[PDB]
Coordinates of C-alpha atoms and ligand atoms in Angstrom, one line a residue:
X1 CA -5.8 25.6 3.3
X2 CA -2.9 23.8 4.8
X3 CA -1.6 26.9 7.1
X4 CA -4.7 27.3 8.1
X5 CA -5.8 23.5 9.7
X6 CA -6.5 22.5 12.9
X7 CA -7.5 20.3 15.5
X8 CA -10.9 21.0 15.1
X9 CA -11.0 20.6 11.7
X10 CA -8.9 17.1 11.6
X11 CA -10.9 16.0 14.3
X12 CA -14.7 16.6 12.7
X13 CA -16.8 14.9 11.4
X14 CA -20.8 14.7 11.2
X15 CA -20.6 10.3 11.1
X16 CA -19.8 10.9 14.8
X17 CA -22.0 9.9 18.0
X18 CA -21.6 11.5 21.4
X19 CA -21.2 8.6 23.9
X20 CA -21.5 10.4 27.7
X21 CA -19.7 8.4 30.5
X22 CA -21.4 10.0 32.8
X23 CA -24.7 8.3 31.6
X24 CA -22.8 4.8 32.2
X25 CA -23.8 2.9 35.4
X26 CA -20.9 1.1 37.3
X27 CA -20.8 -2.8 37.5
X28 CA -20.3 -4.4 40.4
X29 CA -17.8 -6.6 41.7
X30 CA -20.8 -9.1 41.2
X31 CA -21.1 -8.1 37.3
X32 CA -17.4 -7.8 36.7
X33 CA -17.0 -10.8 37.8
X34 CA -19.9 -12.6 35.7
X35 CA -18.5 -10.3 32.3
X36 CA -15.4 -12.1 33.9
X37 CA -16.6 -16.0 33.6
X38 CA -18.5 -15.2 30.0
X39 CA -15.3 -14.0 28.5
X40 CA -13.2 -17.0 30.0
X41 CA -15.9 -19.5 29.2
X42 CA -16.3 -18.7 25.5
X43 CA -16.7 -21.5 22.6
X44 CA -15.3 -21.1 18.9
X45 CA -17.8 -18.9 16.7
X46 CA -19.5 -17.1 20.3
X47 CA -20.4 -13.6 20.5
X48 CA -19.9 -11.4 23.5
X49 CA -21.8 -8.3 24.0
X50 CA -21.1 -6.1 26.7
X51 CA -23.7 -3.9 28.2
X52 CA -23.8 -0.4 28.8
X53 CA -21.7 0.3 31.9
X54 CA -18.3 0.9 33.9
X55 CA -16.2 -2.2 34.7
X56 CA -13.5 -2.1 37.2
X57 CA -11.0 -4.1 37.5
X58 CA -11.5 -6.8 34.9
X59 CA -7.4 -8.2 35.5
X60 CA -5.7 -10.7 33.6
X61 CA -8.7 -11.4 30.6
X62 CA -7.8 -14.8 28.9
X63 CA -9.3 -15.6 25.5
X64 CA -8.5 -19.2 24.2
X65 CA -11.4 -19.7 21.1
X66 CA -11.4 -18.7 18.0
X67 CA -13.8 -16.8 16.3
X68 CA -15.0 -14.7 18.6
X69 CA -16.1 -11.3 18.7
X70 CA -15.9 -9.4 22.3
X71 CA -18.1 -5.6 21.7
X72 CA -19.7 -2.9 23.3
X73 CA -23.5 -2.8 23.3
X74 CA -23.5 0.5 22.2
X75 CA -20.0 1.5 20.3
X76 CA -17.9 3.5 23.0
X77 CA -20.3 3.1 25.9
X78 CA -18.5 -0.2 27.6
X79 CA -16.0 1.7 29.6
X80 CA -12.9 -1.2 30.8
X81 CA -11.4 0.6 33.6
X82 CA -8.6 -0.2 36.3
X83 CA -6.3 -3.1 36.0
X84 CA -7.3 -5.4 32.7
X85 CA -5.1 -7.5 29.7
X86 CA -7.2 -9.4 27.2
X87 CA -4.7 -11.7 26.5
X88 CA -6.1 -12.9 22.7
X89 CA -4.8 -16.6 22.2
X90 CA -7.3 -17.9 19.6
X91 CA -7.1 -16.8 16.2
X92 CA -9.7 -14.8 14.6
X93 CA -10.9 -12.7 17.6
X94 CA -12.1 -9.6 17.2
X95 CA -12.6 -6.5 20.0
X96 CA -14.5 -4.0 19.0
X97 CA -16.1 -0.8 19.8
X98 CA -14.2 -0.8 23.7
X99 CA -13.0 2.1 25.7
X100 CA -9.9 1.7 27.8
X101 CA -9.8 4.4 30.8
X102 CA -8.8 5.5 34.3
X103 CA -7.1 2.3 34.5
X104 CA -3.9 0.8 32.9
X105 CA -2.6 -2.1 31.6
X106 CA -2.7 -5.3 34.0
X107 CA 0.9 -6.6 32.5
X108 CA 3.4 -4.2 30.5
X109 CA 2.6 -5.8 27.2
X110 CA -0.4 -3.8 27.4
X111 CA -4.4 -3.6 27.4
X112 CA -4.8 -5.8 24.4
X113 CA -2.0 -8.8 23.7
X114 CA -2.9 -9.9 19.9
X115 CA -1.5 -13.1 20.1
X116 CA -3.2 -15.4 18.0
X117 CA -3.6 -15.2 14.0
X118 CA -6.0 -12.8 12.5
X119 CA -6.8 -10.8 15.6
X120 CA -8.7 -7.4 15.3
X121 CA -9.1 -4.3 17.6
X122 CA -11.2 -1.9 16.3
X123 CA -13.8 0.7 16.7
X124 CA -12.3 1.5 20.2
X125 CA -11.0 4.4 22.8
X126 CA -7.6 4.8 24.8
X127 CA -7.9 7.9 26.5
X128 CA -5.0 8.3 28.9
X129 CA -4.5 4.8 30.2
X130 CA -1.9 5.7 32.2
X131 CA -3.2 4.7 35.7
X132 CA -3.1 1.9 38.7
X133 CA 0.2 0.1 38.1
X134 CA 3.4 0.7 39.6
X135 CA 5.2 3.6 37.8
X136 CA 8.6 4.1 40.0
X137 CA 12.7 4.6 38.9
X138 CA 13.9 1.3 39.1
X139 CA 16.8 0.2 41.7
X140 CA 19.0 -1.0 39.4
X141 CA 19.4 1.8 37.5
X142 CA 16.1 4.5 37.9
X143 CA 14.5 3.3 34.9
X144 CA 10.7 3.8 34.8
X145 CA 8.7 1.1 33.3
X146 CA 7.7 0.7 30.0
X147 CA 3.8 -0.1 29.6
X148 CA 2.5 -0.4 26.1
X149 CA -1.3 0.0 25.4
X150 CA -1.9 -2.7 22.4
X151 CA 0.8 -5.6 20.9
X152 CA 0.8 -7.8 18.5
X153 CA 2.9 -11.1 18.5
X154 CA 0.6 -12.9 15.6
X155 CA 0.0 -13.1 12.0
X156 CA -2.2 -10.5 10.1
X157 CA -3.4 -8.5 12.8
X158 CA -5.2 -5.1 12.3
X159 CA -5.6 -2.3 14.4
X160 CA -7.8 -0.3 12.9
X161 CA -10.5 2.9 13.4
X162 CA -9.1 2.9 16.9
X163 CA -8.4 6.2 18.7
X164 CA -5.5 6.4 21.0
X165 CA -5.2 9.0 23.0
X166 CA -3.2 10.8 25.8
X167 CA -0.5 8.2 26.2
X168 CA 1.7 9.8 29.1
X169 CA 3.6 7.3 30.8
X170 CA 6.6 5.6 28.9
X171 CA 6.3 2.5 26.5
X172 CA 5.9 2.5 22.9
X173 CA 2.3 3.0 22.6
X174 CA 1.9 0.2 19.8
X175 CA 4.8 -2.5 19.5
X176 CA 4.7 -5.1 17.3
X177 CA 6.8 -8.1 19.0
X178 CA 7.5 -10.3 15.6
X179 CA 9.7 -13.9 14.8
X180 CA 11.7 -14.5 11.4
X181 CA 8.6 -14.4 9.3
X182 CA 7.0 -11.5 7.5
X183 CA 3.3 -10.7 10.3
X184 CA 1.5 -8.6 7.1
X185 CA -0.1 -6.5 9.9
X186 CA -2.3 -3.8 9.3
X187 CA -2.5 -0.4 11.5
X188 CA -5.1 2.2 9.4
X189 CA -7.6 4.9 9.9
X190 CA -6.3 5.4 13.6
X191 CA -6.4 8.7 15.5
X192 CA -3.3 9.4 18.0
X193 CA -3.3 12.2 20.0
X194 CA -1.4 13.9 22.6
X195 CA 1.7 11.3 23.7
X196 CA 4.2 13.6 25.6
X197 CA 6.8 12.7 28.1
X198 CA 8.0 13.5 31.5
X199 CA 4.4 14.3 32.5
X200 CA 5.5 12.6 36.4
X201 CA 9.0 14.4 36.5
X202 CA 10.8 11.4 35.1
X203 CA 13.6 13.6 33.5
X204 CA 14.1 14.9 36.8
X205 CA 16.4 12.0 37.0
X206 CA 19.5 13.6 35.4
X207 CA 21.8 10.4 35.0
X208 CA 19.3 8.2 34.1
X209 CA 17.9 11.0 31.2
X210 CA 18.8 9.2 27.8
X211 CA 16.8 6.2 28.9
X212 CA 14.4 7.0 30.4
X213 CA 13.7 9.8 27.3
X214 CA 13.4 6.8 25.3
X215 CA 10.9 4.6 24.8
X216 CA 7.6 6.7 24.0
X217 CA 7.1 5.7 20.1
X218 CA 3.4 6.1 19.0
X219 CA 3.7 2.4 17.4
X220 CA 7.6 0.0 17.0
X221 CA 7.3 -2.5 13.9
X222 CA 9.9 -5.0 15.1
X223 CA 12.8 -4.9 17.7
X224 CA 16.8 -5.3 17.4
X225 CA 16.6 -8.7 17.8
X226 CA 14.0 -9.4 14.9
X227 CA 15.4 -6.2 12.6
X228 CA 16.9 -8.5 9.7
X229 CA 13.8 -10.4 9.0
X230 CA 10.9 -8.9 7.0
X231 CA 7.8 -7.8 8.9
X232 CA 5.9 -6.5 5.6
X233 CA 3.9 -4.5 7.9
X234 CA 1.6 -1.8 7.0
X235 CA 1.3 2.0 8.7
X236 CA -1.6 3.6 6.5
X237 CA -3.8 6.5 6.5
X238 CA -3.3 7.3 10.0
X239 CA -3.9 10.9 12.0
X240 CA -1.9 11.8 14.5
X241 CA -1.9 15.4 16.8
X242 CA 0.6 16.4 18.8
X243 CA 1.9 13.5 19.2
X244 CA 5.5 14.7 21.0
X245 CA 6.8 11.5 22.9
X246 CA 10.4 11.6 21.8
X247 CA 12.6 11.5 19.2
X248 CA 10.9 9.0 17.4
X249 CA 7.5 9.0 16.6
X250 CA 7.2 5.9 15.0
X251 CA 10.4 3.2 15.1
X252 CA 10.5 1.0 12.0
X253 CA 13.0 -1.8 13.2
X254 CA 12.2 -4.5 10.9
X255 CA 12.4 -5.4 7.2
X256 CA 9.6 -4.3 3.7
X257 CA 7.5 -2.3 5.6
X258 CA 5.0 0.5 4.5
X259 CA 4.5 3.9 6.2
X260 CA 2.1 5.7 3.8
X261 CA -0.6 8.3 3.9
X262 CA -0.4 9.4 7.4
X263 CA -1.4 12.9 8.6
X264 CA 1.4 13.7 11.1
X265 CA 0.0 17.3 12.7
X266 CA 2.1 19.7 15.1
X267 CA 4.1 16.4 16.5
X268 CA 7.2 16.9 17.3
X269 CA 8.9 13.2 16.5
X270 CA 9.9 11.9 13.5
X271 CA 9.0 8.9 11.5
X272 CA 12.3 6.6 12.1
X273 CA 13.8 4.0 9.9
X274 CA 15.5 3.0 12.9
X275 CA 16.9 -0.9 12.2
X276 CA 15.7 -3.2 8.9
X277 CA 15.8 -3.2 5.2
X278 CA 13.7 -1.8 2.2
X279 CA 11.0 0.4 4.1
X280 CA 8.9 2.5 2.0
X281 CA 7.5 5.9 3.5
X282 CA 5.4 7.6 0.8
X283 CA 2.4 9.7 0.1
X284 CA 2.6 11.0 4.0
X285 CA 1.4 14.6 4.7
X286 CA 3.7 16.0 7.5
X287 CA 2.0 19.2 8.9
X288 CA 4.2 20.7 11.4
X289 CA 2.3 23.9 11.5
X290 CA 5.6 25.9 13.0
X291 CA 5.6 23.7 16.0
X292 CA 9.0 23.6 18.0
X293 CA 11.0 20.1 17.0
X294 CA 8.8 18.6 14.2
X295 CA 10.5 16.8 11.2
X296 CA 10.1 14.4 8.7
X297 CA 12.0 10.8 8.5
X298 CA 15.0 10.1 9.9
X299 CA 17.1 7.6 8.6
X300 CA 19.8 4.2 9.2
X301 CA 19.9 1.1 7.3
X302 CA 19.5 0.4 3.7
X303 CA 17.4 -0.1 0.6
X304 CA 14.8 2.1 2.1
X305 CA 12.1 4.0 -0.5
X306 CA 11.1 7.6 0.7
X307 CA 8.9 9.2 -2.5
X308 CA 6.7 11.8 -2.2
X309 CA 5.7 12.7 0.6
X310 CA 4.6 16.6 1.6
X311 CA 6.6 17.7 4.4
X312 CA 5.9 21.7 5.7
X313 CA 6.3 24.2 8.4
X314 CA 8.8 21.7 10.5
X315 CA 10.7 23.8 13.2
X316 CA 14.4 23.2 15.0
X317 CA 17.5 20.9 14.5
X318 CA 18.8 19.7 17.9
X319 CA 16.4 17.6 20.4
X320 CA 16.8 18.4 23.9
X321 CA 18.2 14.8 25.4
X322 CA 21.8 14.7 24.0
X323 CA 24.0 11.7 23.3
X324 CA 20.8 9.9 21.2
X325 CA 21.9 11.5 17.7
X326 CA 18.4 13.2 18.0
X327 CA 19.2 15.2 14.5
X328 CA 15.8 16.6 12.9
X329 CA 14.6 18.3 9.9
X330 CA 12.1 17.1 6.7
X331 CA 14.6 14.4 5.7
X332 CA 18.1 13.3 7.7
X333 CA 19.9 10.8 6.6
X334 CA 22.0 9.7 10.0
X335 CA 25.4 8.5 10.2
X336 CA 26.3 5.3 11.9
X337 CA 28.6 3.5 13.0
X338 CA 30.0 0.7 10.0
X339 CA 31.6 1.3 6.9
X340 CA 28.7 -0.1 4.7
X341 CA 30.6 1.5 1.5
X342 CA 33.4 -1.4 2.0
X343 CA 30.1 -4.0 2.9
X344 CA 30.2 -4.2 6.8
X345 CA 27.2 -5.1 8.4
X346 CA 26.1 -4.7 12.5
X347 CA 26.7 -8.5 13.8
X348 CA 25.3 -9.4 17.2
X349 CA 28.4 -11.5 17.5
X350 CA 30.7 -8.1 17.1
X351 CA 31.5 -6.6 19.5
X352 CA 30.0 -2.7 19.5
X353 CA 28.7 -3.6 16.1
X354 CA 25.4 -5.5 17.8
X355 CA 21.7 -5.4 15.9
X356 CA 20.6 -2.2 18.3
X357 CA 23.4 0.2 17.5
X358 CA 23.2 2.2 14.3
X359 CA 24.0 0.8 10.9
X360 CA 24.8 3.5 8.3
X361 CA 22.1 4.1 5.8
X362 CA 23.1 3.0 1.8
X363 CA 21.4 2.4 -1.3
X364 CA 18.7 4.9 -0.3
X365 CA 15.9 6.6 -3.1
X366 CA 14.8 9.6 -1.9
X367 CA 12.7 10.9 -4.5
X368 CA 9.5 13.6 -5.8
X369 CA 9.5 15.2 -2.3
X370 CA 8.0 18.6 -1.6
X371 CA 9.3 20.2 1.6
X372 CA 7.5 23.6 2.3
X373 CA 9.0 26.4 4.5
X374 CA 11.1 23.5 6.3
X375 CA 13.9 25.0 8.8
X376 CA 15.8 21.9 8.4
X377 CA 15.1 20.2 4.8
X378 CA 17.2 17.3 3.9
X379 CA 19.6 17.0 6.6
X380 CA 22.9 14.9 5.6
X381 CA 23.8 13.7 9.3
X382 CA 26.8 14.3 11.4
X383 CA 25.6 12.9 14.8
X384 CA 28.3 10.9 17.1
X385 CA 26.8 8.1 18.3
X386 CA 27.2 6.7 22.3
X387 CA 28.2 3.1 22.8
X388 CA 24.3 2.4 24.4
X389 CA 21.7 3.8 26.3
X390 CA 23.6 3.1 29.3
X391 CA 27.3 3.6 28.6
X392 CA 28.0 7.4 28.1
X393 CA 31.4 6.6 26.3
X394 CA 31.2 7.9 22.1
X395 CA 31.8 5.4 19.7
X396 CA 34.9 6.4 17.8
X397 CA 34.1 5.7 13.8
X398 CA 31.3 7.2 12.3
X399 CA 30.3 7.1 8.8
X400 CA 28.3 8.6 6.5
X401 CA 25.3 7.7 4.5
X402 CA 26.1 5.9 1.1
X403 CA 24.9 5.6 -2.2
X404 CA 21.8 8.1 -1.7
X405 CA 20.0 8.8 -4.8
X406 CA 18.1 11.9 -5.1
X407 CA 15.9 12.8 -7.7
X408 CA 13.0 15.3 -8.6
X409 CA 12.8 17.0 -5.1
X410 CA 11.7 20.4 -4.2
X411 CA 12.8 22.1 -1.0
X412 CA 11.0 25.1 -1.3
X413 CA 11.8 28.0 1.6
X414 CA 10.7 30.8 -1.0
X415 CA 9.2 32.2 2.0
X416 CA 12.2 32.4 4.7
X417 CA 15.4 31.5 2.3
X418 CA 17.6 31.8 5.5
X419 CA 16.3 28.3 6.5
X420 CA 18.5 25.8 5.5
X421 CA 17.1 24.0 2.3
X422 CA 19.7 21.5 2.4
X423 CA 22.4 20.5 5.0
X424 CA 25.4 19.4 3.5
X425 CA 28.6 18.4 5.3
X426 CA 32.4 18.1 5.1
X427 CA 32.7 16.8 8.1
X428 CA 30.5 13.5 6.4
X429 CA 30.4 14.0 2.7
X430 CA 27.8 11.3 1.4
X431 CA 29.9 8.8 -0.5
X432 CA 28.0 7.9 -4.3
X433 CA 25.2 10.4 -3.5
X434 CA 23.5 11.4 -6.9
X435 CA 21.1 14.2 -7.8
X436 CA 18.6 14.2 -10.6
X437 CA 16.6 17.3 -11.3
X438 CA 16.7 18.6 -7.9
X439 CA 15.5 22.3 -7.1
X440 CA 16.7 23.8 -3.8
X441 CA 15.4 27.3 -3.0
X442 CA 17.0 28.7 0.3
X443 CA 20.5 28.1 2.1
X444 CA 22.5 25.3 1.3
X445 CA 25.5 24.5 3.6
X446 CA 28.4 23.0 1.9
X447 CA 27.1 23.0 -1.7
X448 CA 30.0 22.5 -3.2
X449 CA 29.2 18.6 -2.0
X450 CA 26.7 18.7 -4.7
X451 CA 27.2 18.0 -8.1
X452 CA 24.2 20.3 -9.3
X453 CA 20.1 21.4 -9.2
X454 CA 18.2 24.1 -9.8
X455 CA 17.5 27.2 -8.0
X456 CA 14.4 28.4 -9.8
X457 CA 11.1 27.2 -8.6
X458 CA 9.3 25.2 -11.6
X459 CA 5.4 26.6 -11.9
X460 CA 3.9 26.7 -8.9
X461 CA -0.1 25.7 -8.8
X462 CA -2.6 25.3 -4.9
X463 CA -4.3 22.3 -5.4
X464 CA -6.4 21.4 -2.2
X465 CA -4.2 24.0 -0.6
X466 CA -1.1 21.8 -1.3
X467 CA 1.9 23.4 -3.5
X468 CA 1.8 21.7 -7.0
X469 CA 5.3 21.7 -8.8
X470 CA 5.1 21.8 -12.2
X471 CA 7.2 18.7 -13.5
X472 CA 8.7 18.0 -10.0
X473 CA 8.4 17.3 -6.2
X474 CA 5.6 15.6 -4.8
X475 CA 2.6 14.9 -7.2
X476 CA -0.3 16.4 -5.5
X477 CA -3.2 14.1 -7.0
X478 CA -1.7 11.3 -4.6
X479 CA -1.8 13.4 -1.2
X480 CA -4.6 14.0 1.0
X481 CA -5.0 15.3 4.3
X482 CA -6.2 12.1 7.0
X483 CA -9.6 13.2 9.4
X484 CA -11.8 11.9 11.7
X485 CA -14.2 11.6 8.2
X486 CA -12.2 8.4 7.8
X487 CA -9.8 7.8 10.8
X488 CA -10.9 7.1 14.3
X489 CA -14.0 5.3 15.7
X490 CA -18.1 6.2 14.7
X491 CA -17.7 8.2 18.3
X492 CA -16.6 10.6 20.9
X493 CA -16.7 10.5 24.8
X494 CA -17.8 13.3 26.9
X495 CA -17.2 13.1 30.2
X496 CA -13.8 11.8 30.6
X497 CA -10.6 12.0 33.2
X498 CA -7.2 12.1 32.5
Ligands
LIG501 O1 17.4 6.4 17.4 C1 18.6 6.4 17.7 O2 19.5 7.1 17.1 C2 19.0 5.5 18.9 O3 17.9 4.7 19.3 C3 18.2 3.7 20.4 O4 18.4 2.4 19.8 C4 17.3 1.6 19.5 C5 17.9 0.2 19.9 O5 17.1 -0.8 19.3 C6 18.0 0.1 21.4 O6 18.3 -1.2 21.8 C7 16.6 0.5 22.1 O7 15.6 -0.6 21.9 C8 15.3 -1.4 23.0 C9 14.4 -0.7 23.9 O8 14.3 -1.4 25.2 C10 13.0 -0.5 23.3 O9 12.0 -0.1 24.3 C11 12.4 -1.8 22.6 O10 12.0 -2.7 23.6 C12 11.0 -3.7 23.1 C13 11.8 -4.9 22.5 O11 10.9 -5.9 21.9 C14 12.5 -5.6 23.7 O12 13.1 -6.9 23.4 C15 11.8 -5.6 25.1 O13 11.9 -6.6 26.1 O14 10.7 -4.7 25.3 C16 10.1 -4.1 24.2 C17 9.4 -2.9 24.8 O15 8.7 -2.2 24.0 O16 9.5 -2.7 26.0 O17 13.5 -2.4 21.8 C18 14.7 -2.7 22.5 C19 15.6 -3.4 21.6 O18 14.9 -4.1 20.7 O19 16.8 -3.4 21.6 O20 16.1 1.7 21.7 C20 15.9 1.7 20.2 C21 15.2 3.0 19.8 O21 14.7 3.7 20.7 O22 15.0 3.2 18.6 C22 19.4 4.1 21.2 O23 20.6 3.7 20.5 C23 19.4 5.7 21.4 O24 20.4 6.1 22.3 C24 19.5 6.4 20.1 O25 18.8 7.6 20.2

């Protein structure tokens, strides 16, 4: 029953082999380099299989054929340790069943560069690739680096049954680096686990703070540069665990992308609709279990699609790094920094009005959503936004979000009707906001915003150990909670270091 999950229980399953490092016999400098020469000397259609073992060191990995598959022996017993990039040029390569370990990335684009066309990882292991390359505060300005673990700069890649886990130095852990033409990517059936921050005293760096607190996203779709072009990207049926990097625990910044069916457990980060149009965010289970800081979906941009999703137990309003309009709760809908209602638009030719900075959400749908014992449910924002990461100054005008139709919802905080249900403001009314059926149970701050909804909880049914709403919220019979049964690779490792 959903109170009552764990770790344990998400991560179970009976499909799954024990792989133990510790059985795994380290190459040598002589085999490296030979796995080195077979992997560089590859022709189109080739197969390479990599034997049981430990390899150090493998660098800068550079695949030019297509058609190629690169896998472990055994699934999970090739252990890629130290420095190492496979840099995939061909199309239609495929890695699978790998383990990435006491090691790092060889060049901050990450373990795995997806670079050609149809390009696959799958089956394999990060488990806390965070080791070997330089890691220091910058002289210009005491930035740490950003290393990602996987990219993709291709066409219809997939990243899929992977596991990715303990991601604790900055960089997005999955980025998707994209031109002006949709990539149809697919990341599914993934485990992420344990992504936290300021594990090497980063934040000790006070000025330098709202920077270097950025940057940890468990996977960007698309940057500020490519975030008015279509990446029709998919985030599916994903499991992630404490996954606590920052605000942000997945940035969508790019155009018709789906984020659907994810299990997002005690992480405390938010799934962000951060730059781009018409994202669609559905059928996601959001299982904060109490946990400090965890939240739904935050926000910007417009023609988004947020329906049904099951949102529950989310804790706490106000992220600790200020000045990044860190605003949580089940739902927020930010301000920004444009009046959208009179048409304006961010330009990269205005400036202060440039692709990164924050363009106020409109024409949002934001409908048959169950939020359970939510602290903060739908949040209508009220944040003030700085000018950058770097320049401290606050932008003066800041608007709210536009045209937001709501319909069929249930915030349900039966349980603890202290917590706010719904945050309205009259410091930023919503302009054109409608409401359709909507049933609130719990405070609601500035309801006189609000033209009207219902107070009384329709019938309530446990189905799976989910809240059923008779008539309303989120339909139950599309809702299911994401395990290792499906997610993740056929393994585990035993005998592992951070
Ligand atoms: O969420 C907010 O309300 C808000 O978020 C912050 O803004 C966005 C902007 O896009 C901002 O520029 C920044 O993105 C940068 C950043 O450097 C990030 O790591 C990523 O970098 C990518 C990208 O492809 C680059 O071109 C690059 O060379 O490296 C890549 C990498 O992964 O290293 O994207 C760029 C960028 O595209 O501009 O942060 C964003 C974000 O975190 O969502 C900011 O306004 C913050 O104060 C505020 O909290």
């Amino acid at each position: 029953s959903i109170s009552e999950i764990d770790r344990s229980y998400l991560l179970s399953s009976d499909r799954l082999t024990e792989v133990d490092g510790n059985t795994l016999d380290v190459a040598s400098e002589e085999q490296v380099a030979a796995l080195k020469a077979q992997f560089e000397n590859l022709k189109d259609g080739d197969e390479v299989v990599i034997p049981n073992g430990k390899y150090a060191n493998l660098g800068q990995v550079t695949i030019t054929a297509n058609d190629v598959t690169i896998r472990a022996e055994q699934a999970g017993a090739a252990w890629l340790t130290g420095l190492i990039q496979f840099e995939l040029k061909g199309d239609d390569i495929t890695l699978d069943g790998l383990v990435f370990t006491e090691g790092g990335p060889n060049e901050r684009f990450g373990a795995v560069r997806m670079m050609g066309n149809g390009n696959t990882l799958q089956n394999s292991t990060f488990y806390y690739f965070n080791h070997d390359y330089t890691y220091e505060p910058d002289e210009r300005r005491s930035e740490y680096p950003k290393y990602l673990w996987v990219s993709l700069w291709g066409k219809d890649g997939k990243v899929i049954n992977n596991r990715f886990e303990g991601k604790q130095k900055r960089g997005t852990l999955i980025g998707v680096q994209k031109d002006d033409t949709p990539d149809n990517h697919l990341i599914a059936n993934n485990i992420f686990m344990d992504q936290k921050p300021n594990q090497f005293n980063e934040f000790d760096i006070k000025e330098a703070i709202r920077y270097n607190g950025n940057s940890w996203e468990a996977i960007r779709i698309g940057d500020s540069k490519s975030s008015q072009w279509d990446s029709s990207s998919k985030f599916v049926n994903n499991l992630m665990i404490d996954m606590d990097g920052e605000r942000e625990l997945i940035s969508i910044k790019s155009g018709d992308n789906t984020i659907s069916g994810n299990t997002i457990f005690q992480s405390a980060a938010l799934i962000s609709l951060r730059h781009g149009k018409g994202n669609t965010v559905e059928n996601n289970m959001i299982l904060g279990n109490e946990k400090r800081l965890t939240g739904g979906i935050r926000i910007y941009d417009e023609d988004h699609v947020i329906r049904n999703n099951y949102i529950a137990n989310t804790r706490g309003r106000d992220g600790v790094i200020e000045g990044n309009a860190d605003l949580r709760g089940g739902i927020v809908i930010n301000t920004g920094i444009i009046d959208v209602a009179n048409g304006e638009q961010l330009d990269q030719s205005v400036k202060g009005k440039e692709l990164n900075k924050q363009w106020t959400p409109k024409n949002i749908t934001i409908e048959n959503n169950s939020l359970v014992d939510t602290e903060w449910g739908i949040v209508y924002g009220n944040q003030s936004h700085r000018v950058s990461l770097f320049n401290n100054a606050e932008v003066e005008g800041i608007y709210a979000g536009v045209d937001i139709a709501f319909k069929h919802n249930v915030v349900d905080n039966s349980q603890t009707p202290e917590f706010v249900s719904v945050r309205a403001t009259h410091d930023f009314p919503l302009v054109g906001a409608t409401y359709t059926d909507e049933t609130y149970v719990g405070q609601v701050t500035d309801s006189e915003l609000i033209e009207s909804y219902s107070v009384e909880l329709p019938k309530v049914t446990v189905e799976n150990g989910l809240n059923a709403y008779q008539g309303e919220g989120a339909d139950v019979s599309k809702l299911s909670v994401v395990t290792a049964e499906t997610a993740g690779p056929d393994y585990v490792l035993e005998n592992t270091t951070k």
